[PDB]
Write a protein that binds this ligand. Structure first.
Ligand SMILES: C[S@](=O)CC[C@H](N)C(=O)O
Ligand SMILES: C[S@](=O)CC[C@H](N)C(=O)O
Lengths: 153, 153
C-alpha cells in the first residue's frame, strides 16, 4: 500500500530508447502509455487524448474504457488545453462536480503536448488516491512529453 | 491452467453499446481493446495494428510494449492480411521461429478488419497458455470485429 518510487531517470531513458526512429504518432502514444503503465505505481489509468475538430478525443491508453469526447476548458484535460499548461490535481473531487466519475480517480495529472507550439493532445494519468502527483512528478512527466514531442516534431 | 468462461453474449452487447454513435477509429479501437481486456481471462496482450503504406503499424492495445511494424505476409498478423482471413494459432511456438518472442505468448488469434472491401487493420490477441481460442471464441470475436466494422463503415 506504500507508493513504491518511480526511477524517472531510467524512465526517460527507457522512453527515448523505446520511440527512437519512430515518427508515427499512434504507435508512439500506444507504446508510451504501456511504458508509463509499467513504471508508475498506484495509478488506474494512463493515456492520451488528441485535439481534433476543436475538442479532445480519446487516443491510446492503458486501463478501463473512458470518455471519448472532452470539450476544451472542461475537466482536467480540457483545462490543460484551454490554459496550455500542465494540470496537477491533488484532489480531483473538489475539482468540478462529484458525480458518477468519482471512481478510482482521487488525484490526477494532465500534461499538454505541443508540436510547433500548438496543442496536439494531452497526457492523462489517474490515481486511486489523493496527492499522488507533485511538482517532481510534474517536472519529470513533462520531460517525457518532451521526449515524445521530439519524435513527432 | 483453466480458462474462466467468457460471456460473449454480454460482451457483444457492451461492445455495440460501448461504441454506439461513435465513428472515430482510434477512439473506438482504444475503448475496444480495453473492453476486450476486461472481459477475457487468460490472455496477455490485446490490441490492433493498422494497415498503412503496405504494412501493419501498431495501434491501440492493452498490455506491455509491442513491436511497431509488421510487414504484410509476415508473422501471424502479416499472414492474416496477406491471406485476408482469420488466423488461429494453437501453439505460437511451432509457428515461424522460436526466438526472443516465445515470452508469455503461447497461443494467439488474429482477425483482419475490413472497410468496404479493403483491410484497414487487424485485431490481435495473445494468451499465456496454449489452445486458448477455440472455434467458439473465434466466431464471437469475429462478431466483435463486425460490430467494430459497422462503426467504421
Ligand atoms: C478530462 S477529465 O477532467 C478526466 C479524464 C479521466 N482522467 C480519464 O481517464 O479520461
Ligand atoms: C506477426 S506477430 O507474430 C503479431 C503481433 C504480436 N502478437 C503481438 O502480440 O504484438
Amino acid at each position: 500500500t506504500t507508493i513504491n518510487p518511480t526511477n524517472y531517470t531510467l524512465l526517460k531513458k527507457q522512453a527515448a530508447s523505446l520511440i527512437e526512429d519512430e515518427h508515427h504518432m499512434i504507435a508512439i502514444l500506444s507504446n508510451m502509455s504501456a511504458l508509463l503503465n509499467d513504471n508508475l505505481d498506484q495509478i488506474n489509468w494512463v493515456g492520451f487524448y488528441l485535439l481534433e475538430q476543436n475538442e479532445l478525443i480519446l487516443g491510446p491508453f492503458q486501463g478501463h474504457p473512458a470518455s471519448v469526447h472532452i470539450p476544451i476548458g472542461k475537466g482536467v484535460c480540457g483545462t490543460a488545453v484551454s490554459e496550455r499548461r500542465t494540470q496537477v490535481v491533488a484532489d480531483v473531487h473538489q475539482f468540478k462536480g462529484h458525480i458518477a466519475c468519482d471512481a478510482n480517480s482521487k488525484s490526477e495529472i494532465v500534461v499538454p503536448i505541443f508540436k510547433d507550439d500548438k496543442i496536439i493532445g494531452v497526457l492523462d494519468i489517474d490515481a486511486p488516491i489523493t496527492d499522488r502527483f507533485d511538482d517532481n512528478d510534474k517536472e519529470h512527466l513533462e520531460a517525457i512529453v518532451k521526449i515524445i514531442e521530439k519524435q513527432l516534431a
